[PDB]
């Protein structure tokens, strides 16, 4: 049978396949099932397509894992970038706003991403209950981009006065758009929190959970494997620790 992988389209889009291609060969040489790359806009719909088990495995962001565990989904792996599985969340606004804080962004424009995204939603949500708000009740308008670099775009441009957006997004349109960086500042960082993990549908057999767990964790000492990391910028993927998204867990609970 077919092994499908599905994908958010809204993190790199019309290089999704350029990106993931010699990984799904990679996975196609560990099972020796054809693979079929399924992409949807949302982490939501990702998320339902792990629910209904209409896909085997899914690229998903740290919140929507939280979601996706209570339905079981099983954690397969996490990548290691800069030599580290872990993320985080930047407050940024332009050096020139005069907006130096989270706190100076009360009644001002606000971008999100994903609803479902950590860095680009969730962390910043969390934070507000402390002061009994929401996004809705803090900020004067919010919007939500499904891209981090869209997000950035906003901010660039003075569409919005401030966005919450993945640290690594963040510190890589720096390098690439250097006027743009100039004229950015982070105000704030959230809690360090686990990467994103890579998941499988509640569905699949023990035997074949314990096949890819292994083609994940051993894929930096196989040639095809070496080439798919390389291709998405991954060091190696390293074994989940429950606990790295405790933090978020706690956040979800405090809606």
């Given at each position: 049978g077919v092994f499908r992988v599905a994908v958010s389209s809204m993190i790199s889009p019309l290089e999704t396949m350029k990106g993931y291609g010699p990984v799904l060969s990679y996975i196609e040489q560990q099972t020796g099932r054809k693979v079929e790359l399924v992409q949807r806009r949302?982490?939501?719909?990702?998320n339902e397509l792990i629910r209904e088990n209409k896909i085997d495995l899914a690229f998903i962001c740290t919140y929507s894992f939280v979601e996706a565990e209570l339905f079981g989904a099983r954690p397969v792996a996490v990548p290691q970038v800069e030599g580290?599985?872990?993320?985080?969340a930047v407050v940024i606004t332009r050096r020139d706003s005069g907006i130096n804080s989270l706190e100076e962004l009360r009644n001002k424009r606000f971008a999100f991403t994903d609803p479902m995204s950590?860095?680009?939603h969730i962390a910043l949500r969390g934070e507000?209950?402390?002061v009994d708000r929401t996004p809705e009740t803090f900020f004067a308008s919010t919007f939500y981009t499904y891209s981090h670099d869209n997000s950035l775009r906003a901010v660039y441009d003075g569409i919005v006065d401030g966005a919450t957006i993945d640290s690594l997004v963040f510190r890589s349109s720096n390098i690439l758009y250097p006027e743009i960086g100039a004229a950015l500042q982070v105000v704030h960082v959230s809690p360090?929190?686990?990467a994103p993990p890579v998941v499988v549908s509640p569905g699949l057999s023990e035997e074949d959970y314990q096949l890819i767990r292994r083609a994940f964790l051993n894929m930096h000492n196989e040639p095809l494997g070496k080439?798919?990391?390389?291709?998405?910028?991954i060091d190696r993927f390293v074994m989940v620790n429950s606990?790295?998204?405790?933090?978020?867990?706690?956040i979800a609970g405090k809606i």
């Open positions: 949302t982490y939501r719909e990702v580290n599985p872990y993320a985080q950590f860095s680009g507000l209950v402390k360090l929190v686990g080439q798919a990391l390389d291709t998405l910028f606990g790295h998204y405790d933090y978020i867990r706690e």
